[PDB]
Amino acid sequence: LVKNKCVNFNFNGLTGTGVLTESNKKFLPFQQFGRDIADTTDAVRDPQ
Amino acid sequence: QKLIANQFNSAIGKIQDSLSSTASALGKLQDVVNQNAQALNTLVKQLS
Ligand SMILES: *[C@@H]1O[C@H](CO)[C@@H](O)[C@H](O)[C@H]1NC(C)=O
Incomplete structure (x- = not known):
C-alpha cells in the first residue's frame, strides 16, 4: 500500500482512483466504506 | 445634535x-x- 501519492486502486471490489493517505475518521468495525455528502467514496478500510 | 447622536449610536446597537x-x-x-450548492448536488447525483 502506498500513501500520499496519486495511485490507482482496487480494495475488495471497491474500484477507484485517488490519493490514499492516513486518516483519523474512526470507521465502524462492521463497516467497510466511508462516503461523503455527494455519495462519492471518501474513505476506506484496509482489510489486511 | 446630542439627541441625534444618541438616537444614531443606539440605533447602531440594535x-x-x-x-x-x-x-x-x-x-x-x-x-x-x-441554490448554488444546491444545484451542484443535483448536478452530481446525476452521475449516479
Ligand atoms: C496480515 O498479516 C500479518 C502478518 O502476516 C498479521 O499480523 C495481520 O494480522 C494480518 N492481517 C489480518 C487482517 O489478519
Missing part, C-alpha cells in the same frame, strides 16, 4: 442584536449560497 440573534435577515445571501 443592528448587532438584530443580526446577533435573528438569523432571518441574511436569508437572501443565505439563499444564493444554497
